[PDB]
């Protein structure tokens, strides 16, 4: 009974999001709501999803579909929705590990 049952790959979404967060000044679709607490707030889910769709060259991409990917991040304790906030997302796992890990 005990063996590998769920083998699921991860997505590069987090990087493109951070990329947009770094140059968010002209986008304003998403920005940090709290830098040190690792909390970011989605201002426009449509624009964010549109940019993802544009960059991967696919038509009709919306936050509805993106949410499925976020569900993968929740269970891995990467992205959090802090109790009481639905549009606020917090990093439980931090990119610091990647930068100083590589």
From Swiss-Prot:
DNA-binding residues: 11-92
Location relative to the cell: Nucleus
Top-level taxon of origin: Eukaryota
Cross-link Glycyl lysine isopeptide (Lys-Gly) (interchain with G-Cter in SUMO2) placement: 75, 93
Disulfide bonds: none
Similarity annotation: Belongs to the ETS family.
Function: Transcriptional repressor; binds to the DNA sequence 5'-CCGGAAGT-3'. Plays a role in hematopoiesis and malignant transformation.
Subunit structure: Can form homodimers or heterodimers with TEL2 or FLI1. Interacts with L3MBTL1 and HDAC9.
Name assigned to this protein: Transcription factor ETV6
Organism: Mus musculus
Residues of the full protein shown: 329 to 426 of 485
């Amino acid at each position: 009974g005990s063996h590998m049952g769920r083998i699921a790959d991860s997505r590069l979404l987090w990087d493109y999001v951070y990329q947009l967060l770094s140059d968010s000044r002209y986008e304003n679709f998403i920005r940090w709501e709290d830098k040190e607490s690792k909390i970011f707030r989605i201002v426009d889910p449509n624009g964010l999803a549109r940019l993802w769709g544009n960059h991967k060259n696919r038509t009709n991409m919306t936050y509805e579909k993106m949410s499925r990917a976020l569900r993968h991040y929740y269970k891995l304790n990467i992205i959090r929705k802090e109790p009481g906030q639905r549009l606020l997302f917090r990093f439980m796992k931090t990119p610091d590990e990647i930068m100083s890990g590589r």
